[PDB]
Amino acid sequence: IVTVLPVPPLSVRPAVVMQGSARNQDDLTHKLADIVKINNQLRRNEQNGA
Amino acid sequence: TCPNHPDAILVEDYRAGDMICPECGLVVGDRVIDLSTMIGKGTGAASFDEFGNSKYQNRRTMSSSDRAMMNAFKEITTMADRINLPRNIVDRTNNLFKQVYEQKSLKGRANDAIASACLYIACRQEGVPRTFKEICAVSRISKKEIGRCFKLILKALETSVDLITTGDFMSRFCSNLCLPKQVQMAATHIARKAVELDLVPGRSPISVAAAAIYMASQASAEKRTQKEIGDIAGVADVTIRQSYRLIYPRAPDLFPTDFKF
Amino acid sequence: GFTGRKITSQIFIGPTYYQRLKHMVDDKIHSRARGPIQILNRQPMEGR
RNA sequence: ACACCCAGCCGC
Ligand SMILES: [Zn+2]
């Protein structure tokens, strides 16, 4: 049972190019941003007390 | 970064795949190279609760400011599509809106007012200006509010816009009135000559532009009524009669060399 | 054509409609020697 | 200067 989630490095989920200034990230990077956002929300809501 | 050669630029060879020195040919570096999600609808029925609702849906938080910018861009696109503007003006409008919204000075006014004001600014800056009434036709906002918002945008964002001339509106007015090229050239010449010779001190360029339309219209086979001119220009028929009765003396001088009267 | 001799088998000759297809060999020839590589895995890239 | 998706086509 996982209680810490190992984030992969930038080699596993690198940023791609387009025209240039985009610097689009991998799908793992976007989902991990979502993971960190939901985890931070839960971690604050633990003592905020909903 | 070539050894034995300080301050040497490296030619990057995207075909050979290396970074190569134009004095000795060494290679530095062995090879060259080159946020959210949506939860959709469930396929299987195993995700449905006893009351349905599938228990897994997109929370769509995405801040407040990003929501405001997205709604504003939607309003800009659906506003500019009505008068059929090219997308370069739309993108310039979005650029001005983002600069204004990040300038943080116009929170006290409706976002739609800043939106239509940025549309007017972008239409001005491309050399194809629209009148205020044309923007007001495709916007839910009065002319007073758009005027005040335009005044506050020019005061706040610190930019200069070119003063309008009559010749910018002539092509749109004639083409939307379905008039040929000779009428276009004659009306533009009449408008520019009336501006430069000084018959119209302080008169609005929109009134004398529609006056030049009426000049070119009431001299050929096709003729346009005052009501049609006011419909296509937005100026009232009294303003057209004011410009008519003030432009009527010295008529052949305003005309071009040949028109086929 | 080389020796000028008669061919002792009478060749079937005549006009026939031929068509040149899109596939020319200069549009297909392709070679590599340690060229560019991908970002994700450092393998060589795909396609001519 | 990409990365997915789609389509068409080549040889067996
Ligand atoms: Zn060198």
UniProtKB/Swiss-Prot annotation, chain B:
The keyword Cytoplasm does not apply. PROSITE patterns: TFIIB, ZF_TFIIB. GO terms for molecular function: acetyltransferase activity; DNA-binding transcription factor binding; histone acetyltransferase activity; nuclear thyroid hormone receptor binding; promoter-specific chromatin binding; RNA polymerase II complex binding; RNA polymerase II core promoter sequence-specific DNA binding; RNA polymerase II general transcription initiation factor activity. Keywords: Acetylation, Acyltransferase, Chromosome, DNA-binding, Host-virus interaction, Metal-binding, Nucleus, Phosphoprotein, Repeat, Transcription, Transcription regulation, Transferase, Zinc, Zinc-finger. Found in a ternary complex with TATA box-bound TBP. Part of a TFIID-containing RNA polymerase II pre-initiation complex (PIC) that is composed of TBP and at least GTF2A1, GTF2A2, GTF2E1, GTF2E2, GTF2F1, GTF2H2, GTF2H3, GTF2H4, GTF2H5, GTF2B, TCEA1, ERCC2, ERCC3, TAF1, TAF2, TAF3, TAF4, TAF5, TAF6, TAF7, TAF8, TAF9, TAF10, TAF11, TAF12 and TAF13. Associates with TFIID-TFIIA (DA complex) to form TFIID-TFIIA-TFIIB (DAB complex), which is then recognized by RNA polymerase II (Pol II). Found in a RNA polymerase II initiation complex. DNA binds at residues 107, 109, 144, 151, 203, 227, 236, 239, 241, 245. It comes from Homo sapiens. CDD domains: CYCLIN_TFIIB_rpt1, CYCLIN_TFIIB_rpt2. Sequence repeats lie at residues 79-155, 173-249. GO terms for biological process: DNA-templated transcription initiation; meiotic sister chromatid cohesion; positive regulation of core promoter binding; protein acetylation; RNA polymerase II core complex assembly; RNA polymerase II preinitiation complex assembly; spindle assembly; transcription by RNA polymerase II. Pfam families: TFIIB (PF00382), Zn_Ribbon_TF (PF08271). General transcription factor that plays a role in transcription initiation by RNA polymerase II (Pol II). Involved in the pre-initiation complex (PIC) formation and Pol II recruitment at promoter DNA. Together with the TATA box-bound TBP forms the core initiation complex and provides a bridge between TBP and the Pol II-TFIIF complex. Released from the PIC early following the onset of transcription during the initiation and elongation transition and reassociates with TBP during the next transcription cycle. Associates with chromatin to core promoter-specific regions. Changing residue 193 to A: Abolishes autoacetylation, represses transcription activity, does not inhibit its association with chromatin to promoter-specific regions and decreases the association of GTF2F1 with chromatin to promoter-specific regions. Its EC number is 2.3.1.48. Zn(2+) binds at residues 2, 5, 21, 24. This is Transcription initiation factor IIB. Changing residue 155 to E: Reduces interaction with SSU72. Inhibits interaction with VP16. Inhibits RNA pol II transcription activation induced by VP16 but does not affect basal transcription. The modification Phosphoserine is found at residue 47. SUPFAM superfamilies: Cyclin-like, Zinc beta-ribbon.
